[PDB]
Design a binder for this molecule. Structure first.
Ligand code: HEM
Ligand code: HEM
Ligand SMILES: CC(C)(C)OC(=O)N[C@@H](CS[C@@H](Cc1ccccc1)C(=O)NCCc1cccnc1)Cc1c[nH]c2ccccc12
Ligand SMILES: CC(C)(C)OC(=O)N[C@@H](CS[C@@H](Cc1ccccc1)C(=O)NCCc1cccnc1)Cc1c[nH]c2ccccc12
Lengths: 453, 453
């Protein structure tokens, strides 16, 4: 436990670390509550130890921008390593340094205005599928779980945009391309034990053990294999028309990330939005009127249409403030440097507590409140872009931001053009966040669902 | 590698062990071929090292009987430990010493003549289900995979005899009690690495890591929980009417063993029998005539009926000779002893190569040949019961032998009363055993299936 003296030696405040454990015991109410408290009592900057691993939390907007934007390329290029990952070492959000910049550049042109617009008609054909699957249980007239219906849609949109495999996942709880997809709590019996035994990570790699257990990976290594080639002899088509090289084992890796980034993220965030609309009927009514004014006769949405609806964009943005699913942003400092006057030694994980910053009184009137008006053009300047970062910032931000926004909103428009949502008995008000290690509802989101004519 | 001198020090022949690896590299053609060769060139007794773990192979019938029967209770009580197993430490085939004898005695009355006879009508109702599912693909007229149809049946018979949950598993590739059940190669990237790093086993236990990965276990911990009690407020009923205590976490453990012991074992052995019948039509015809003579008009079988058909018992026994799915029997020596004149130090795993002994010319005319006549009452005395041990022997033999025999034969009778089996093009002749670490067909068993009227 010789590494625990670093934050007194640097004169930086923080909770006292226990031997070997560090501050991990302070995670008993999730990263979010521990960040909000630390912020409230330690101020602009503090430190703590994930095991032996020092973690410096910063909150200065000039400092955050130095880490995310300015000195990203030179100093803060990687996220904190975690394992074991096996062949997934080559995935973009996990890769580091020069083979990240290789993958980041190779994969950036997959989320371009021209390519995103070229996906509107394809996934608009699933918005319709979302409607009929949702109409059936509107006459059922008993509470509806959104994570499952949104999952099916978001999954349907992923499979299609990723491999062209068109399936009604709700009505097909079966077929091979939806079974494995159904198959990371940083605080379960396991990931706690790898922050207390980070020295055990090389042991599990030698054992080919993977946190992505090798039953799902093997399905796709061949599901892509035959469909790489002898099934067509789309993110995939846009990676083979360039297959700075790109191995086919490295091609499977990015496919998995895209699939999880946008099935759990897209549906979790869509569930948080329908909760906030159902417990704020005022907003729901305001949004149904904006949608119908841009799209008369329940018209099909287009790329240009969606960038226009700005109360819809206002609603999405505020939900992300209250529920930024990443919670934190993390960069590993690559060398002895000194930003904003303070000194950062080699190896420290520099951390940014997105959740807590999204709820700081020193920036947000009525923090816990759901006020989509904060983001209207009248007020969307009193908002620091380095305090509101649900997609990160800088070269290593969310490569799928524009697609995530565009997909969620297309789901929202076609859904609100036809249905409305009311709180139930099982409906939890106010929603309590997970005690665990990600940002999901403690109890699933289930609501009343009526229909218009 | 200080432990590798033990077999020169004892003056016992064997292959020379490499540092750290031992003789594991000699497993490149399965345990079976390595046992047959060692036997052929080293004789009655030899030794080798699974990593640092010395393993003494014996073949004397008086010696085998001393280890399995005489000094089982005092010296050779456990099988060689393997892990990580988590809560499955309390399962009977894994438990050791005084808590094994507790579980062995507590669970023995579940396989009694009176209880086995009380299962005939229940599983005879599934023999019928086996027929109709098999009739459909008799008119299809294209090769039939037996492991899948036998799996469904054997599974149907397990679920019912274990929890009363009656399901058509082939026609239900779905329901929760058949999904997880579908979910151990001692030679994959993993189990090789735990015989070279047996010192890493305590590491994975600390991590709650299990070779029974915790997705299946958790289903049953609660699937039994509510059906323990508030679903009826059968092996299960026969364990709760006594729930020397028996914890409920220990109750889930035995349930898993029974389920795997008799879904993969019962269906693997049934697939080996239909292969041997289809490539020996003579025997198949001889068996169809014995069945029809005991059971006229395709009559339903009974407990007394099955013990009577002795060519059927002859066919089963010979298949087990050629394919004894356990391959080896193993006991861990608990103290310095000296049996049959030779000296056994503390800690050595004493091993018996069932497969190779089942194919030894010094006991078996035409070893590779399928001659069910070896087991007729005319010849079933020229057969040493410590050379033919498909169910082991002694206090720690197969507790489910009588049930396994009774179940397989009931499957065989109702099937042969209605169908016949012929070799195909994809049919592999002769069958080649798995290069891997268990005894299964290298390529699945698929055969032509006709029908009688
Ligand atoms: C509501 C939806 C989403 C949210 C809120 C979100 C948020 C984030 C955040 C905060 C980061 C970290 C940024 C940083 O470190 O500064 C990130 C990274 C990333 N996201 Fe997203 N994301 C979403 C959807 C998606 C989708 C749909 C995809 C892909 C199809 C995606 C792909 C990625 C990738 C690849 C990275 C790692 C980037 C890198 O390391 O270079 N995300 N996301
Ligand atoms: C064709 C079917 C089967 C074969 C060939 C077979 C064979 C064997 C063999 C060779 C052993 C080791 C005996 C020894 O160590 O000397 C064994 C152990 C065992 N078998 Fe079976 N078995 C079969 C089916 C079953 C079934 C259906 C069950 C349970 C329902 C079962 C339960 C067990 C148990 C619990 C043990 C461990 C006994 C102990 O450690 O006390 N087996 N089996
Ligand atoms: C919701 C969230 C992001 C907070 O937790 C997650 O469940 N996922 C982790 C684990 S890692 C992995 C994702 C994964 C997880 C389970 C099974 C397969 C793959 C990966 O390779 N990619 C992440 C894809 C993604 C998710 C959300 C937004 N965009 C991109 C944490 C994490 C991974 N990448 C990050 C980037 C920034 C901040 C946090 C993370
Ligand atoms: C076919 C065989 C027996 C050679 O390989 C096996 O796949 N199973 C191993 C692993 S262990 C486990 C079984 C298990 C395996 C996978 C998933 C869950 C549980 C256990 O707890 N019970 C074994 C039940 C059984 C199987 C066959 C006959 N009777 C009883 C080896 C093994 C376990 N027990 C033995 C007893 C004697 C000889 C070998 C073994």
């Amino acid at each position: 436990t010789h590494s625990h003296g670093l934050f007194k030696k640097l004169g930086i405040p923080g909770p006292t670390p226990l031997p070997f454990l560090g501050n991990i015991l302070s995670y008993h109410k999730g990263f979010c509550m521990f960040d909000m408290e630390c912020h409230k009592k330690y101020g602009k900057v503090w430190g703590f130890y994930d095991g032996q691993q020092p973690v410096l939390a910063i909150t200065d907007p000039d400092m955050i921008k130095t880490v995310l934007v300015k000195e990203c390329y030179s100093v803060f290029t990687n996220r904190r390593p975690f394992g074991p990952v096996g062949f997934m070492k080559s995935a973009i959000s996990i890769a580091e340094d020069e083979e990240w910049k290789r993958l980041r550049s190779l994969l950036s042109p997959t989320f371009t205005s021209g390519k995103l617009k070229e996906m509107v008609p394809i996934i608009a054909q699933y918005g319709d599928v979302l409607v009929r699957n949702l109409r059936r249980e509107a006459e059922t007239g008993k509470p509806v779980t959104l994570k499952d219906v949104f999952g099916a849609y978001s999954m349907d949109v992923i499979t299609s945009t990723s491999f062209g495999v068109n399936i009604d996942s709700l009505n097909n709880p079966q077929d091979p391309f939806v079974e494995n997809t159904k198959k990371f709590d940083f605080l379960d019996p396991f990931f706690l034990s790898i922050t207390v035994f980070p020295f055990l990570i090389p042991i599990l790699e030698v054992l080919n053990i993977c946190v992505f257990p090798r039953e799902v990976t093997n399905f796709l290594r061949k599901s892509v294999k035959r469909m790489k080639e002898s099934r067509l002899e789309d993110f995939l088509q846009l990676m083979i028309d360039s297959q700075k090289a790109l191995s086919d084992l490295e091609l499977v890796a990015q496919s998995i990330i895209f699939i999880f980034a946008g099935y759990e993220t897209t549906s979790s965030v869509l569930s948080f939005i329908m909760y906030e609309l159902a417990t704020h009927p005022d907003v729901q009514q305001k949004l149904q009127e904006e949608i119908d004014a841009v799209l008369p006769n329940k018209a099909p949405p287009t790329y240009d249409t969606v960038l226009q609806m700005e109360y819809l964009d206002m609603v999405v943005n505020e939900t992300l403030r209250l529920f930024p699913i990443a919670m934190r942003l993390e960069r590993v400092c690559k060398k002895d440097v000194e930003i904003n006057g303070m000194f950062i030694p080699k190896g420290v994980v520099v951390m940014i507590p997105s959740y807590a910053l999204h709820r700081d009184p020193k920036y947000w009137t009525e923090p816990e409140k759901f006020l989509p008006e904060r983001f209207s053009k009248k007020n969307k300047d009193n908002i620091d872009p380095y305090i509101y970062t649900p997609f990160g910032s800088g070269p290593r931000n969310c490569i799928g931001m524009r697609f995530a926004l565009m997909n969620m909103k297309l789901a929202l428009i076609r859904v609100l053009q036809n249905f409305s949502f009311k709180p139930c008995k099982e409906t939890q008000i106010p929603l309590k966040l997970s005690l665990g290690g990600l940002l999901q509802p403690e109890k699933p989101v289930v609501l009343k669902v009526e229909s218009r004519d």
